[PDB]
Amino acid sequence: RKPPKGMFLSQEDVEAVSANATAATTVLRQLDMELVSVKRQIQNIKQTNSALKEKLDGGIEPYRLPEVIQKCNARWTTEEQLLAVQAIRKYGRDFQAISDVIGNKSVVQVKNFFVNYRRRFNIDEVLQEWEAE
């Protein structure tokens, strides 16, 4: 038939437990030892880990900045135009950032601008700057 359920007996395993007089209690202690090793390796990486949890005690709560909820306008103020260029200068094409930076332009408007002005703000020349980084 097939080995009663749960009972385990590989071809290979039987060779191993017979092929000398006490290959029996070699293979058994081998594991008894190679076990307590892995248990001691856990103790390290559990204590190594409870230090790094000490070092995070605080979360980031003192360091978080209120959420400014802003009215995604279509007025390009000269103030906003400059913010934009400087963001392009430092973000490349991450239009998501460049929106978050200005704080009143949807990624649409940022991509709009990105071509409408484009030659007026030498945006090619500016983006080739974000290359040298």
């Binding site: 385990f8 058994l28 594991l31 360091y63 900045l65 978050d100 930076v101």
Partner: protein
Amino acid sequence: GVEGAAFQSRLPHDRMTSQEAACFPDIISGPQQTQKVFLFIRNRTLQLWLDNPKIQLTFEATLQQLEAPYNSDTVLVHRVHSYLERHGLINFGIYKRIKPLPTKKTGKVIIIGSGVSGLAAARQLQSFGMDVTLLEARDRVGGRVATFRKGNYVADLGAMVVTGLGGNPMAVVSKQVNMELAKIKQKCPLYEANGQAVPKEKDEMVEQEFNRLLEATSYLSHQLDFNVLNNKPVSLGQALEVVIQLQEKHVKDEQIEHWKKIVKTQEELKELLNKMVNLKEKIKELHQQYKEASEVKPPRDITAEFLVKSKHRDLTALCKEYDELAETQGKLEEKLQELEANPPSDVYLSSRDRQILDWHFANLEFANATPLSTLSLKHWDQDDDFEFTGSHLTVRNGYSCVPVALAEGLDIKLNTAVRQVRYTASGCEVIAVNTRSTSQTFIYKCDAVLCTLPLGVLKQQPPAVQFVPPLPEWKTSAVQRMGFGNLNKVVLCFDRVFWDPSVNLFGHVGSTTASRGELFLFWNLYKAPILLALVAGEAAGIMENISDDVIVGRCLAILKGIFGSSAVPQPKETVVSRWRADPWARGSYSYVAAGSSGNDYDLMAQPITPGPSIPGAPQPIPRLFFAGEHTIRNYPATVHGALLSGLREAGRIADQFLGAM
């Protein structure tokens, strides 16, 4: 119907046997129609015998109750009835005869031993009208069917069990004798060293494992072919150890790969606590830098306005990242307490279980009368396809009742130890002696010897019995190869019943493996207050040296712990078996030793044919025949087996010395 008598005579109702093909070759070689006629006639004649086996079934009586077109061919009905009669399928055991015994006898047979094998053959031969004389060394019949008797005390030191009546010859014998059969109540509570019962919980979940460990060996044997190990044949015991070890090995192997699957996790948590610390770092910086840059009170030029807004974004970015990494820190830290909460099995078997498993093994060593270290892994259970159906029973009034019944009216010389068996072209002489004055010598001349000497005796070195000429290598090699085991009994008689009287049997669990057999199991199944303690396993061997008293000691001790020191009297009288030391047994019964097979049981039954007296003379008749539990492949080491082995040789001897039927 009739079909049931075929099953009860151990025959297939729908097919002709090899035995039948040999005797009815015309029928079996020819038309399918006549086969079915034959088979009905056989099945019916059996049914007839069986439905009342206390009176001889004549050829006449058979033809009477037969139908047409079956009572058509009366030569065929005759041939069939005579075949069944010869081969001991009808008119066997203790029937009232109709036609009294042949006036004048034909042929002389000496039967060695009045065991059940012996007595069964004797009755057959005598009823076929031969001069039969049994030579028994003991002062009694029965051999390994012994009973103890004294007042109403009654306890088998020998066989005690009938293996259930579905195809059991003893079915018929029991109808022919005052044989009080009582089914065995299968409840058997265990009781560890101290005395405490075994919680039902456990008892089940070990026996479960025991059964599983066996199936395991059968797998290891058949599927993986694990049957030789560096030239020696593989023991069942060896296989059992190998399986158990591989079960300890897995238990560990699993633990290993669980704790291993923790570090994979606990060391992913580390690779993250790092990113999360080198971000509390990067975020510290960024906040300062934003604070410092928001210092610059407005109005400010657009570079300093950008630097503020730039940093603000940059820092809410890294505050996102750290929230998605303490997302992760949450899940991983649960996944860890999951693995911490359900760890695979600690051990394979508690040393308290390994002890209860040892009793389930002791029970197997009792059944087989040998250390499991000796049983053939491949063949230990070759008889298994032939077990009768029905619950096992016990003889309430002593099994002895059966041998004695059979012995009535036979020429039995008791206290006659056979010393030499000589067989030649021309006949045989058996030289025996009186057991009491050894020097008083007897000589029996006969056409045939039937040897029911026990395998133990056949094995004695140096020989108890000398064969002249000597048994051929093929026979002697079989005798060395087969196992003859051992198994003693302690008969404890008491003034009154201090045990559960609805309980047939209850185990004791030995401290260590090495003593698993030692009074491991107690039987109350006699009418008077009597307990039977088995010694099985390596123990049976050693207990024979230790003295009657010590044994009855270890024995009472064990009972006190289980029934309280108050209620355990000194025993009225005690007996201890010592079967290995009994020289008319040299042990208890046969086993399939590693490096044996069933085929050896067959060699043991093969009769010996002497060489010719004058060179260049015709091939003689065989002279030396063998029966007993060691000779019957399909029903070894039992009474029914012996019983059958006897019936068999009688037919083979009749066929030779009286011409076939």
